mmCIF file with all atom_site columns, C-alpha atoms in Angstrom:
data_model
loop_
_atom_site.group_PDB
_atom_site.id
_atom_site.type_symbol
_atom_site.label_atom_id
_atom_site.label_alt_id
_atom_site.label_comp_id
_atom_site.label_asym_id
_atom_site.label_entity_id
_atom_site.label_seq_id
_atom_site.pdbx_PDB_ins_code
_atom_site.Cartn_x
_atom_site.Cartn_y
_atom_site.Cartn_z
_atom_site.occupancy
_atom_site.B_iso_or_equiv
_atom_site.pdbx_formal_charge
_atom_site.auth_seq_id
_atom_site.auth_comp_id
_atom_site.auth_asym_id
_atom_site.auth_atom_id
_atom_site.pdbx_PDB_model_num
ATOM 1   C CA . UNK A 1 1   ? 103.077 77.543  82.543  1.00 47.84 ? 4   UNK A CA 1
ATOM 2   C CA . UNK A 1 2   ? 100.114 79.845  84.172  1.00 47.37 ? 5   UNK A CA 1
ATOM 3   C CA . UNK A 1 3   ? 100.975 81.553  87.148  1.00 44.76 ? 6   UNK A CA 1
ATOM 4   C CA . UNK A 1 4   ? 98.742  82.629  89.941  1.00 44.75 ? 7   UNK A CA 1
ATOM 5   C CA . UNK A 1 5   ? 100.601 83.727  92.928  1.00 44.92 ? 8   UNK A CA 1
ATOM 6   C CA . UNK A 1 6   ? 104.102 84.647  93.757  1.00 45.74 ? 9   UNK A CA 1
ATOM 7   C CA . UNK A 1 7   ? 106.685 82.748  92.115  1.00 45.70 ? 10  UNK A CA 1
ATOM 8   C CA . UNK A 1 8   ? 110.114 82.828  90.459  1.00 47.01 ? 11  UNK A CA 1
ATOM 9   C CA . UNK A 1 9   ? 112.093 81.245  88.107  1.00 45.66 ? 12  UNK A CA 1
ATOM 10  C CA . UNK A 1 10  ? 114.154 81.067  84.708  1.00 46.30 ? 13  UNK A CA 1
ATOM 11  C CA . UNK A 1 11  ? 112.424 79.534  81.538  1.00 42.99 ? 14  UNK A CA 1
ATOM 12  C CA . UNK A 1 12  ? 113.864 79.590  77.993  1.00 37.68 ? 15  UNK A CA 1
ATOM 13  C CA . UNK A 1 13  ? 117.195 81.964  79.147  1.00 39.04 ? 16  UNK A CA 1
ATOM 14  C CA . UNK A 1 14  ? 114.797 84.546  80.931  1.00 38.94 ? 17  UNK A CA 1
ATOM 15  C CA . UNK A 1 15  ? 114.181 84.801  84.661  1.00 35.45 ? 18  UNK A CA 1
ATOM 16  C CA . UNK A 1 16  ? 110.463 85.381  85.248  1.00 35.31 ? 19  UNK A CA 1
ATOM 17  C CA . UNK A 1 17  ? 108.445 86.657  88.219  1.00 33.18 ? 20  UNK A CA 1
ATOM 18  C CA . UNK A 1 18  ? 104.817 87.445  89.676  1.00 32.41 ? 21  UNK A CA 1
ATOM 19  C CA . UNK A 1 19  ? 104.788 88.670  92.692  1.00 30.93 ? 22  UNK A CA 1
ATOM 20  C CA . UNK A 1 20  ? 101.601 90.908  94.457  1.00 31.44 ? 23  UNK A CA 1
ATOM 21  C CA . UNK A 1 21  ? 100.601 91.672  98.216  1.00 31.40 ? 24  UNK A CA 1
ATOM 22  C CA . UNK A 1 22  ? 97.426  90.744  97.671  1.00 28.25 ? 25  UNK A CA 1
ATOM 23  C CA . UNK A 1 23  ? 94.835  90.587  94.901  1.00 30.23 ? 26  UNK A CA 1
ATOM 24  C CA . UNK A 1 24  ? 94.041  88.735  91.653  1.00 29.58 ? 27  UNK A CA 1
ATOM 25  C CA . UNK A 1 25  ? 96.560  88.065  89.468  1.00 30.42 ? 28  UNK A CA 1
ATOM 26  C CA . UNK A 1 26  ? 97.587  85.608  86.318  1.00 31.45 ? 29  UNK A CA 1
ATOM 27  C CA . UNK A 1 27  ? 100.559 85.689  84.011  1.00 30.26 ? 30  UNK A CA 1
ATOM 28  C CA . UNK A 1 28  ? 101.100 83.077  81.102  1.00 28.54 ? 31  UNK A CA 1
ATOM 29  C CA . UNK A 1 29  ? 104.809 82.093  80.664  1.00 28.22 ? 32  UNK A CA 1
ATOM 30  C CA . UNK A 1 30  ? 105.099 82.056  76.480  1.00 26.42 ? 33  UNK A CA 1
ATOM 31  C CA . UNK A 1 31  ? 108.264 81.552  74.526  1.00 28.50 ? 34  UNK A CA 1
ATOM 32  C CA . UNK A 1 32  ? 111.559 83.357  75.211  1.00 30.29 ? 35  UNK A CA 1
ATOM 33  C CA . UNK A 1 33  ? 110.837 86.931  76.950  1.00 30.29 ? 36  UNK A CA 1
ATOM 34  C CA . UNK A 1 34  ? 107.283 86.827  76.164  1.00 30.91 ? 37  UNK A CA 1
ATOM 35  C CA . UNK A 1 35  ? 104.342 86.504  78.831  1.00 32.52 ? 38  UNK A CA 1
ATOM 36  C CA . UNK A 1 36  ? 100.737 87.699  79.405  1.00 34.06 ? 39  UNK A CA 1
ATOM 37  C CA . UNK A 1 37  ? 99.312  89.249  82.495  1.00 33.54 ? 40  UNK A CA 1
ATOM 38  C CA . UNK A 1 38  ? 95.829  90.202  83.986  1.00 32.70 ? 41  UNK A CA 1
ATOM 39  C CA . UNK A 1 39  ? 95.438  91.593  87.670  1.00 30.23 ? 42  UNK A CA 1
ATOM 40  C CA . UNK A 1 40  ? 92.254  93.236  89.256  1.00 31.52 ? 43  UNK A CA 1
ATOM 41  C CA . UNK A 1 41  ? 91.572  93.948  93.089  1.00 33.22 ? 44  UNK A CA 1
ATOM 42  C CA . UNK A 1 42  ? 95.400  94.158  93.793  1.00 34.16 ? 45  UNK A CA 1
ATOM 43  C CA . UNK A 1 43  ? 97.009  96.689  96.470  1.00 32.39 ? 46  UNK A CA 1
ATOM 44  C CA . UNK A 1 44  ? 100.722 95.975  94.686  1.00 30.52 ? 47  UNK A CA 1
ATOM 45  C CA . UNK A 1 45  ? 101.317 93.701  92.184  1.00 29.09 ? 48  UNK A CA 1
ATOM 46  C CA . UNK A 1 46  ? 104.058 93.159  89.122  1.00 33.77 ? 49  UNK A CA 1
ATOM 47  C CA . UNK A 1 47  ? 104.802 90.692  86.557  1.00 33.29 ? 50  UNK A CA 1
ATOM 48  C CA . UNK A 1 48  ? 108.428 90.632  84.745  1.00 33.84 ? 51  UNK A CA 1
ATOM 49  C CA . UNK A 1 49  ? 110.945 89.054  82.431  1.00 34.22 ? 52  UNK A CA 1
ATOM 50  C CA . UNK A 1 50  ? 114.404 89.630  81.818  1.00 32.84 ? 53  UNK A CA 1
ATOM 51  C CA . UNK A 1 51  ? 117.569 88.621  83.390  1.00 32.34 ? 54  UNK A CA 1
ATOM 52  C CA . UNK A 1 52  ? 119.558 88.609  86.878  1.00 34.11 ? 55  UNK A CA 1
ATOM 53  C CA . UNK A 1 53  ? 123.230 88.957  85.705  1.00 34.80 ? 56  UNK A CA 1
ATOM 54  C CA . UNK A 1 54  ? 125.549 86.042  86.734  1.00 34.57 ? 57  UNK A CA 1
ATOM 55  C CA . UNK A 1 55  ? 128.430 88.363  87.300  1.00 34.39 ? 58  UNK A CA 1
ATOM 56  C CA . UNK A 1 56  ? 129.213 91.183  89.189  1.00 33.51 ? 59  UNK A CA 1
ATOM 57  C CA . UNK A 1 57  ? 130.089 93.785  86.490  1.00 31.11 ? 60  UNK A CA 1
ATOM 58  C CA . UNK A 1 58  ? 129.970 97.088  85.527  1.00 31.32 ? 61  UNK A CA 1
ATOM 59  C CA . UNK A 1 59  ? 127.744 97.734  81.907  1.00 30.21 ? 62  UNK A CA 1
ATOM 60  C CA . UNK A 1 60  ? 130.954 98.719  80.369  1.00 27.19 ? 63  UNK A CA 1
ATOM 61  C CA . UNK A 1 61  ? 131.948 95.047  80.946  1.00 25.22 ? 64  UNK A CA 1
ATOM 62  C CA . UNK A 1 62  ? 128.471 93.153  80.381  1.00 24.68 ? 65  UNK A CA 1
ATOM 63  C CA . UNK A 1 63  ? 128.330 94.687  77.004  1.00 25.12 ? 66  UNK A CA 1
ATOM 64  C CA . UNK A 1 64  ? 124.788 96.134  75.382  1.00 26.24 ? 67  UNK A CA 1
ATOM 65  C CA . UNK A 1 65  ? 121.637 95.541  77.241  1.00 26.73 ? 68  UNK A CA 1
ATOM 66  C CA . UNK A 1 66  ? 118.953 96.424  75.379  1.00 28.64 ? 69  UNK A CA 1
ATOM 67  C CA . UNK A 1 67  ? 114.714 95.039  75.108  1.00 28.35 ? 70  UNK A CA 1
ATOM 68  C CA . UNK A 1 68  ? 113.592 95.392  71.586  1.00 29.13 ? 71  UNK A CA 1
ATOM 69  C CA . UNK A 1 69  ? 109.975 94.707  73.203  1.00 28.18 ? 72  UNK A CA 1
ATOM 70  C CA . UNK A 1 70  ? 106.324 95.029  72.010  1.00 24.63 ? 73  UNK A CA 1
ATOM 71  C CA . UNK A 1 71  ? 103.071 95.100  74.185  1.00 23.11 ? 74  UNK A CA 1
ATOM 72  C CA . UNK A 1 72  ? 99.641  95.183  74.095  1.00 23.47 ? 75  UNK A CA 1
ATOM 73  C CA . UNK A 1 73  ? 98.830  97.603  77.284  1.00 25.22 ? 76  UNK A CA 1
ATOM 74  C CA . UNK A 1 74  ? 95.687  98.104  78.734  1.00 23.76 ? 77  UNK A CA 1
ATOM 75  C CA . UNK A 1 75  ? 96.003  99.206  82.106  1.00 20.53 ? 78  UNK A CA 1
ATOM 76  C CA . UNK A 1 76  ? 92.966  100.178 83.791  1.00 18.29 ? 79  UNK A CA 1
ATOM 77  C CA . UNK A 1 77  ? 94.091  102.428 86.683  1.00 14.12 ? 80  UNK A CA 1
ATOM 78  C CA . UNK A 1 78  ? 97.457  103.058 88.275  1.00 16.86 ? 81  UNK A CA 1
ATOM 79  C CA . UNK A 1 79  ? 100.358 100.710 86.238  1.00 13.22 ? 82  UNK A CA 1
ATOM 80  C CA . UNK A 1 80  ? 102.946 101.565 84.396  1.00 13.53 ? 83  UNK A CA 1
ATOM 81  C CA . UNK A 1 81  ? 105.421 99.667  81.761  1.00 12.70 ? 84  UNK A CA 1
ATOM 82  C CA . UNK A 1 82  ? 109.085 99.875  82.072  1.00 11.69 ? 85  UNK A CA 1
ATOM 83  C CA . UNK A 1 83  ? 112.335 98.380  82.125  1.00 11.18 ? 86  UNK A CA 1
ATOM 84  C CA . UNK A 1 84  ? 113.257 97.826  85.965  1.00 11.49 ? 87  UNK A CA 1
ATOM 85  C CA . UNK A 1 85  ? 116.426 96.784  87.838  1.00 10.61 ? 88  UNK A CA 1
ATOM 86  C CA . UNK A 1 86  ? 119.167 97.135  90.266  1.00 11.16 ? 89  UNK A CA 1
ATOM 87  C CA . UNK A 1 87  ? 122.974 98.043  90.690  1.00 10.73 ? 90  UNK A CA 1
ATOM 88  C CA . UNK A 1 88  ? 124.767 97.070  93.721  1.00 9.97  ? 91  UNK A CA 1
ATOM 89  C CA . UNK A 1 89  ? 128.014 99.160  94.953  1.00 9.93  ? 92  UNK A CA 1
ATOM 90  C CA . UNK A 1 90  ? 126.179 101.615 94.454  1.00 9.54  ? 93  UNK A CA 1
ATOM 91  C CA . UNK A 1 91  ? 122.612 100.652 94.978  1.00 12.50 ? 94  UNK A CA 1
ATOM 92  C CA . UNK A 1 92  ? 120.644 101.796 92.751  1.00 10.71 ? 95  UNK A CA 1
ATOM 93  C CA . UNK A 1 93  ? 116.951 100.782 91.594  1.00 10.78 ? 96  UNK A CA 1
ATOM 94  C CA . UNK A 1 94  ? 116.390 101.803 88.355  1.00 8.99  ? 97  UNK A CA 1
ATOM 95  C CA . UNK A 1 95  ? 113.230 102.302 85.623  1.00 7.82  ? 98  UNK A CA 1
ATOM 96  C CA . UNK A 1 96  ? 112.837 103.408 82.215  1.00 7.81  ? 99  UNK A CA 1
ATOM 97  C CA . UNK A 1 97  ? 109.425 103.848 81.517  1.00 6.04  ? 100 UNK A CA 1
ATOM 98  C CA . UNK A 1 98  ? 107.282 103.813 78.542  1.00 8.56  ? 101 UNK A CA 1
ATOM 99  C CA . UNK A 1 99  ? 104.019 103.939 78.998  1.00 10.35 ? 102 UNK A CA 1
ATOM 100 C CA . UNK A 1 100 ? 101.502 104.277 82.304  1.00 9.46  ? 103 UNK A CA 1
ATOM 101 C CA . UNK A 1 101 ? 97.766  104.055 83.031  1.00 7.80  ? 104 UNK A CA 1
ATOM 102 C CA . UNK A 1 102 ? 96.349  106.843 85.224  1.00 6.54  ? 105 UNK A CA 1
ATOM 103 C CA . UNK A 1 103 ? 99.463  108.247 86.789  1.00 7.13  ? 106 UNK A CA 1
ATOM 104 C CA . UNK A 1 104 ? 102.794 109.084 85.571  1.00 8.07  ? 107 UNK A CA 1
ATOM 105 C CA . UNK A 1 105 ? 105.363 107.951 87.557  1.00 7.28  ? 108 UNK A CA 1
ATOM 106 C CA . UNK A 1 106 ? 107.680 108.916 89.612  1.00 5.18  ? 109 UNK A CA 1
ATOM 107 C CA . UNK A 1 107 ? 105.974 112.277 90.696  1.00 4.85  ? 110 UNK A CA 1
ATOM 108 C CA . UNK A 1 108 ? 108.600 115.032 91.973  1.00 4.44  ? 111 UNK A CA 1
ATOM 109 C CA . UNK A 1 109 ? 110.540 117.216 89.418  1.00 7.25  ? 112 UNK A CA 1
ATOM 110 C CA . UNK A 1 110 ? 112.611 116.179 86.688  1.00 6.53  ? 113 UNK A CA 1
ATOM 111 C CA . UNK A 1 111 ? 116.269 117.001 86.514  1.00 3.30  ? 114 UNK A CA 1
ATOM 112 C CA . UNK A 1 112 ? 117.098 116.125 82.589  1.00 2.00  ? 115 UNK A CA 1
ATOM 113 C CA . UNK A 1 113 ? 116.183 115.591 79.350  1.00 2.00  ? 116 UNK A CA 1
ATOM 114 C CA . UNK A 1 114 ? 117.553 112.221 77.412  1.00 2.00  ? 117 UNK A CA 1
ATOM 115 C CA . UNK A 1 115 ? 116.520 112.085 73.923  1.00 2.00  ? 118 UNK A CA 1
ATOM 116 C CA . UNK A 1 116 ? 117.212 108.530 72.869  1.00 2.00  ? 119 UNK A CA 1
ATOM 117 C CA . UNK A 1 117 ? 114.909 105.559 70.834  1.00 2.00  ? 120 UNK A CA 1
ATOM 118 C CA . UNK A 1 118 ? 112.848 108.190 68.712  1.00 2.00  ? 121 UNK A CA 1
ATOM 119 C CA . UNK A 1 119 ? 111.868 109.882 72.384  1.00 2.00  ? 122 UNK A CA 1
ATOM 120 C CA . UNK A 1 120 ? 112.663 112.231 75.139  1.00 2.00  ? 123 UNK A CA 1
ATOM 121 C CA . UNK A 1 121 ? 112.937 110.684 78.641  1.00 2.00  ? 124 UNK A CA 1
ATOM 122 C CA . UNK A 1 122 ? 112.616 112.693 81.421  1.00 2.00  ? 125 UNK A CA 1
ATOM 123 C CA . UNK A 1 123 ? 115.304 111.923 84.268  1.00 2.00  ? 126 UNK A CA 1
ATOM 124 C CA . UNK A 1 124 ? 114.649 111.802 88.076  1.00 2.00  ? 127 UNK A CA 1
ATOM 125 C CA . UNK A 1 125 ? 116.382 110.492 90.950  1.00 2.00  ? 128 UNK A CA 1
ATOM 126 C CA . UNK A 1 126 ? 115.689 110.372 94.469  1.00 2.00  ? 129 UNK A CA 1
ATOM 127 C CA . UNK A 1 127 ? 116.838 108.617 98.089  1.00 2.00  ? 130 UNK A CA 1
ATOM 128 C CA . UNK A 1 128 ? 115.105 106.464 99.992  1.00 2.00  ? 131 UNK A CA 1
ATOM 129 C CA . UNK A 1 129 ? 116.515 105.851 103.505 1.00 2.00  ? 132 UNK A CA 1
ATOM 130 C CA . UNK A 1 130 ? 116.316 102.825 105.272 1.00 2.00  ? 133 UNK A CA 1
ATOM 131 C CA . UNK A 1 131 ? 113.851 101.306 103.064 1.00 2.00  ? 134 UNK A CA 1
ATOM 132 C CA . UNK A 1 132 ? 113.447 97.421  101.589 1.00 2.00  ? 135 UNK A CA 1
ATOM 133 C CA . UNK A 1 133 ? 115.623 96.629  98.985  1.00 2.00  ? 136 UNK A CA 1
ATOM 134 C CA . UNK A 1 134 ? 117.178 93.841  97.393  1.00 2.00  ? 137 UNK A CA 1
ATOM 135 C CA . UNK A 1 135 ? 120.177 93.819  100.291 1.00 2.00  ? 138 UNK A CA 1
ATOM 136 C CA . UNK A 1 136 ? 117.389 94.262  103.241 1.00 2.00  ? 139 UNK A CA 1
ATOM 137 C CA . UNK A 1 137 ? 116.361 97.305  104.922 1.00 2.00  ? 140 UNK A CA 1
ATOM 138 C CA . UNK A 1 138 ? 118.979 99.957  103.778 1.00 2.00  ? 141 UNK A CA 1
ATOM 139 C CA . UNK A 1 139 ? 119.278 103.209 101.697 1.00 2.00  ? 142 UNK A CA 1
ATOM 140 C CA . UNK A 1 140 ? 119.525 103.217 98.379  1.00 2.00  ? 143 UNK A CA 1
ATOM 141 C CA . UNK A 1 141 ? 119.038 105.698 95.156  1.00 2.00  ? 144 UNK A CA 1
ATOM 142 C CA . UNK A 1 142 ? 116.086 105.345 92.575  1.00 2.00  ? 145 UNK A CA 1
ATOM 143 C CA . UNK A 1 143 ? 117.007 106.469 89.017  1.00 2.00  ? 146 UNK A CA 1
ATOM 144 C CA . UNK A 1 144 ? 114.061 107.340 86.476  1.00 2.00  ? 147 UNK A CA 1
ATOM 145 C CA . UNK A 1 145 ? 113.959 108.055 82.975  1.00 2.00  ? 148 UNK A CA 1
ATOM 146 C CA . UNK A 1 146 ? 110.572 108.231 82.185  1.00 2.00  ? 149 UNK A CA 1
ATOM 147 C CA . UNK A 1 147 ? 109.014 109.352 78.661  1.00 2.00  ? 150 UNK A CA 1
ATOM 148 C CA . UNK A 1 148 ? 107.493 112.277 77.931  1.00 2.00  ? 151 UNK A CA 1
ATOM 149 C CA . UNK A 1 149 ? 104.824 110.504 75.819  1.00 2.00  ? 152 UNK A CA 1
ATOM 150 C CA . UNK A 1 150 ? 103.742 106.760 75.801  1.00 2.00  ? 153 UNK A CA 1
ATOM 151 C CA . UNK A 1 151 ? 104.673 104.350 73.648  1.00 2.00  ? 154 UNK A CA 1
ATOM 152 C CA . UNK A 1 152 ? 104.469 100.887 73.776  1.00 2.00  ? 155 UNK A CA 1
ATOM 153 C CA . UNK A 1 153 ? 106.670 99.100  71.232  1.00 2.00  ? 156 UNK A CA 1
ATOM 154 C CA . UNK A 1 154 ? 109.886 99.629  70.343  1.00 2.00  ? 157 UNK A CA 1
ATOM 155 C CA . UNK A 1 155 ? 113.827 99.476  71.404  1.00 2.00  ? 158 UNK A CA 1
ATOM 156 C CA . UNK A 1 156 ? 114.734 100.364 75.344  1.00 2.00  ? 159 UNK A CA 1
ATOM 157 C CA . UNK A 1 157 ? 118.521 100.526 75.009  1.00 2.00  ? 160 UNK A CA 1
ATOM 158 C CA . UNK A 1 158 ? 119.063 100.278 78.401  1.00 2.00  ? 161 UNK A CA 1
ATOM 159 C CA . UNK A 1 159 ? 123.032 101.112 77.985  1.00 2.00  ? 162 UNK A CA 1
ATOM 160 C CA . UNK A 1 160 ? 122.598 104.592 76.612  1.00 2.00  ? 163 UNK A CA 1
ATOM 161 C CA . UNK A 1 161 ? 120.372 105.600 79.661  1.00 2.00  ? 164 UNK A CA 1
ATOM 162 C CA . UNK A 1 162 ? 122.825 104.247 81.731  1.00 2.00  ? 165 UNK A CA 1
ATOM 163 C CA . UNK A 1 163 ? 125.728 105.995 79.939  1.00 2.00  ? 166 UNK A CA 1
ATOM 164 C CA . UNK A 1 164 ? 123.588 109.486 80.136  1.00 2.00  ? 167 UNK A CA 1
ATOM 165 C CA . UNK A 1 165 ? 122.575 109.175 83.625  1.00 2.00  ? 168 UNK A CA 1
ATOM 166 C CA . UNK A 1 166 ? 126.407 108.490 84.338  1.00 2.00  ? 169 UNK A CA 1
ATOM 167 C CA . UNK A 1 167 ? 127.115 111.696 81.765  1.00 2.00  ? 170 UNK A CA 1
ATOM 168 C CA . UNK A 1 168 ? 124.321 113.567 84.366  1.00 2.00  ? 171 UNK A CA 1
ATOM 169 C CA . UNK A 1 169 ? 126.757 112.583 87.402  1.00 2.00  ? 172 UNK A CA 1
ATOM 170 C CA . UNK A 1 170 ? 124.359 109.645 88.505  1.00 2.00  ? 173 UNK A CA 1
ATOM 171 C CA . UNK A 1 171 ? 126.974 106.660 89.205  1.00 2.00  ? 174 UNK A CA 1
ATOM 172 C CA . UNK A 1 172 ? 125.727 102.932 88.331  1.00 2.00  ? 175 UNK A CA 1
ATOM 173 C CA . UNK A 1 173 ? 127.453 100.303 90.275  1.00 2.00  ? 176 UNK A CA 1
ATOM 174 C CA . UNK A 1 174 ? 127.669 96.506  88.717  1.00 2.00  ? 177 UNK A CA 1
ATOM 175 C CA . UNK A 1 175 ? 124.132 95.351  87.146  1.00 2.00  ? 178 UNK A CA 1
ATOM 176 C CA . UNK A 1 176 ? 122.275 93.217  89.479  1.00 2.00  ? 179 UNK A CA 1
ATOM 177 C CA . UNK A 1 177 ? 119.273 92.684  87.066  1.00 2.00  ? 180 UNK A CA 1
ATOM 178 C CA . UNK A 1 178 ? 117.396 94.266  84.239  1.00 2.00  ? 181 UNK A CA 1
ATOM 179 C CA . UNK A 1 179 ? 113.946 93.241  83.053  1.00 2.00  ? 182 UNK A CA 1
ATOM 180 C CA . UNK A 1 180 ? 110.695 94.362  81.450  1.00 2.00  ? 183 UNK A CA 1
ATOM 181 C CA . UNK A 1 181 ? 108.226 95.062  83.671  1.00 2.00  ? 184 UNK A CA 1
ATOM 182 C CA . UNK A 1 182 ? 104.687 95.537  84.339  1.00 2.00  ? 185 UNK A CA 1
ATOM 183 C CA . UNK A 1 183 ? 103.286 97.044  87.265  1.00 2.00  ? 186 UNK A CA 1
ATOM 184 C CA . UNK A 1 184 ? 100.047 97.407  88.882  1.00 2.00  ? 187 UNK A CA 1
ATOM 185 C CA . UNK A 1 185 ? 98.619  99.728  91.882  1.00 2.00  ? 188 UNK A CA 1
ATOM 186 C CA . UNK A 1 186 ? 95.146  99.212  93.396  1.00 2.00  ? 189 UNK A CA 1
ATOM 187 C CA . UNK A 1 187 ? 93.685  98.806  90.144  1.00 2.00  ? 190 UNK A CA 1
ATOM 188 C CA . UNK A 1 188 ? 92.981  96.234  87.332  1.00 2.00  ? 191 UNK A CA 1
ATOM 189 C CA . UNK A 1 189 ? 94.628  95.605  84.224  1.00 2.00  ? 192 UNK A CA 1
ATOM 190 C CA . UNK A 1 190 ? 96.444  93.474  81.677  1.00 2.00  ? 193 UNK A CA 1
ATOM 191 C CA . UNK A 1 191 ? 98.824  93.560  79.212  1.00 2.00  ? 194 UNK A CA 1
ATOM 192 C CA . UNK A 1 192 ? 100.256 91.035  76.669  1.00 2.00  ? 195 UNK A CA 1
ATOM 193 C CA . UNK A 1 193 ? 103.874 91.259  76.072  1.00 2.00  ? 196 UNK A CA 1
ATOM 194 C CA . UNK A 1 194 ? 104.164 89.776  72.262  1.00 2.00  ? 197 UNK A CA 1
ATOM 195 C CA . UNK A 1 195 ? 107.831 90.873  71.418  1.00 2.00  ? 198 UNK A CA 1
ATOM 196 C CA . UNK A 1 196 ? 110.454 90.846  74.370  1.00 2.00  ? 199 UNK A CA 1
ATOM 197 C CA . UNK A 1 197 ? 114.367 90.174  72.797  1.00 2.00  ? 200 UNK A CA 1
ATOM 198 C CA . UNK A 1 198 ? 116.533 91.123  75.523  1.00 2.00  ? 201 UNK A CA 1
ATOM 199 C CA . UNK A 1 199 ? 120.077 91.853  74.183  1.00 2.00  ? 202 UNK A CA 1
ATOM 200 C CA . UNK A 1 200 ? 122.794 91.111  76.590  1.00 2.00  ? 203 UNK A CA 1
ATOM 201 C CA . UNK A 1 201 ? 126.712 91.660  75.218  1.00 2.00  ? 204 UNK A CA 1
ATOM 202 C CA . UNK A 1 202 ? 128.973 92.937  72.728  1.00 2.00  ? 205 UNK A CA 1
ATOM 203 C CA . UNK A 1 203 ? 128.982 96.847  71.196  1.00 2.00  ? 206 UNK A CA 1
#
């Protein structure tokens, strides 16, 4: 229930992962979607809990996807706190970022704004040509919604970001996974996800 090295698994209905390329990481797996983590001397690391979806379905088929979450979030350098996931056909890596450390991701310039869940989100898109992905080295898009001001608790209605992105011409494939995610880059920090209730279904 405390992880220190790369591991993926499932507990209490939530898929979890700790991953780092190097450095010190720890992750306490608490009930349900909740977890606690710390990192130092890392290059890249991530800690996440959510779901790898069991079918090959669109978000209209899966039903509502939302995270009712709360995190006591103390990054010491580069870091962000987000919902993270992928779609396939088309292949998309997506991010809904609510807070960050020293650097607000992803860089570049937004193409729109979404007013949802009491906040304003900047929308970004990238193409990454022949780069590592969940389907090997290949080309994929990245979609980002990044809050204009930091917050660390509330509801992220992922379905509404999906719908807004599609209205802005950003096609969603079948949903592969979605998880509440803490990232670190060349930094130290800690975060306690004390609440993470992931809705999957219905309207």
